[PDB]
Paper text:
The side chain of Tyr163 plays an important role in stabilizing the conformation of the L2/L3 loop region, which docks to the minor groove of DNA response elements via Arg248. The guanidium group of Arg249 stabilizes a hairpin-like, binding-competent conformation of the L3 loop via a salt bridge with Glu171 and hydrogen bonds with the backbone oxygens of Gly245 and Met246. This orientation is further stabilized via a cation-π interaction of the guanidinium group with the side chain of Tyr163, which in turn packs against the hydrophobic side chains of Val173 and Ile251. As anticipated, the loss of the phenol group in the Y163C mutant resulted in the formation of a cavity, and the crystal structure of the mutant revealed the incorporation of two additional structural water molecules next to the mutation site that are stabilized by an extended hydrogen bond network. The guanidinium group of Arg249 was rotated by about 90° relative to its orientation in the wild type, thereby forming a stacking interaction with the imidazole ring of His168 while retaining the salt bridge with Glu171. This was accompanied by a flip of the Asn247 side chain, which formed a hydrogen bond to one of the two mutant-specific structural water molecules and the guanidium group of Arg249 (water molecule W1 in Fig. 4B). There were also notable structural shifts in the backbone of the L3 loop region from residues 242 to 249. Y163C showed a conformational but no functional rescue, which can be explained by a substantial stabilization upon ATO treatment but local distortion of the L3 loop in the DNA-binding surface in the folded state that prevents sequence-specific DNA binding. Lack of temperature sensitivity and local distortions in the DNA-binding interface of the Y163C mutant are a strong indication that merely stabilizing the protein may not be sufficient for functional rescue, unless there is a simultaneous, specific restoration of the local conformation of the DNA-binding surface around the mutation site. Although the mutation-induced pocket in the crystal structure of the Y163C mutant appears not that attractive a target at first sight due to its relatively small size, our MD simulations revealed a pronounced structural plasticity, with transient protein states that are characterized by a drastically enlarged binding pocket.
The tumor suppressor p53 is inactivated by mutation in about half of all cancer cases. Most p53 cancer mutations are missense mutations clustering in the DNA-binding domain (DBD). Due to its low intrinsic stability, the human p53 DBD is very susceptible to inactivation by destabilizing mutations, resulting in unfolding, followed by rapid aggregation at body temperature. Here, we have systematically analyzed the structural and stability effects of all oncogenic Tyr-to-Cys mutations (Y126C, Y163C, Y205C, Y220C, Y234C, and Y236C) in the p53 DNA-binding domain (DBD).
Numbering used by the authors: 94 to 290
The structure:
C-alpha cells in the first residue's frame, strides 16, 4: 500500500545513460536540459527529445520504461498523475491513458501501464539501436501537465526515472532527471542557474 521505485543510477553491463540536446536558454527553446541541476525544462505537451546512450547493444526484446515520482521524501509515496483539468481535456492521442503525465510521441509501439500493486503509471517502448547516421537512440516524450498544476505535479519537484529492462522486466540500467514543465523553459533554466553562485 506504500512503496517507491528505486532511483539509483545504474549503468549496468551495456553502459546505459541518458543524454540531452545542448539547446541553451534562448527564450524560444521548447525544451532545455541543465547539467548542473540534472533538470529538464520543457513546455506543456511538446516534444522532449531524450537520448539513450549505450556502450554495447542490449539483447533482443529490451525495453525502455519512463515513470515519474515525487522527488521529496515526504511525497514519494504519492502517485504522480495528471490534474483534474488536463485529464478531462480532449488531447488524447488514442494510446495514452488520460491520467498519465508522461506520453511517448511518434511511437505506435508505446505501451502504458497502471501497476496492479503500486498503482504507478509508466510508459514503455521497445529499445531500438541508433538509426543510420546516429550514435544514440532518441525517444520523444511529452509531459501532459504543468509543474504548477494542482492535483497534478502540485508545484513539487518531480523526477523522471528511465529504466532499461529485459523482455521479462529485469533491470539492465537506470538513469533519472528532474523535470519542470513551464511556459518558458529557457528563461526558467537561466533563472534557476543564476542562483548557482
Ligand atoms: Zn494539469
Amino acid at each position: 500500500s506504500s512503496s517507491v521505485p528505486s532511483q539509483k543510477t545504474y549503468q549496468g553491463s551495456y553502459g546505459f545513460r541518458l543524454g540531452f540536446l545542448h539547446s541553451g536558454t534562448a527564450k524560444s527553446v521548447t525544451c532545455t536540459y541543465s547539467p548542473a541541476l540534472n533538470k529538464l525544462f520543457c513546455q506543456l505537451a511538446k516534444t522532449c527529445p531524450v537520448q539513450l546512450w549505450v556502450d554495447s547493444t542490449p539483447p533482443p526484446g529490451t525495453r525502455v520504461r519512463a515513470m515519474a515520482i515525487c522527488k521529496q521524501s515526504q511525497h514519494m509515496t504519492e502517485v504522480v498523475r495528471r490534474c483534474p483539468h488536463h485529464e478531462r481535456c480532449s488531447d488524447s492521442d488514442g494510446l495514452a491513458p488520460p491520467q498519465h503525465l508522461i506520453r511517448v510521441e511518434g511511437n505506435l509501439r508505446a505501451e502504458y501501464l497502471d501497476d496492479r500493486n503500486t498503482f504507478r503509471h509508466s510508459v514503455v517502448v521497445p529499445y531500438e539501436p541508433p538509426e543510420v547516421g546516429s550514435d544514440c537512440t532518441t525517444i520523444h516524450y511529452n509531459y501532459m501537465c504543468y509543474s504548477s498544476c494542482m492535483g497534478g505535479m502540485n508545484r513539487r519537484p518531480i523526477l523522471t526515472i528511465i529504466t532499461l529492462e529485459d523482455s521479462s522486466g529485469n533491470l539492465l540500467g537506470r538513469d533519472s532527471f528532474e523535470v519542470r514543465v513551464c511556459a518558458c523553459p529557457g528563461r526558467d533554466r537561466r533563472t534557476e542557474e543564476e542562483n548557482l553562485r
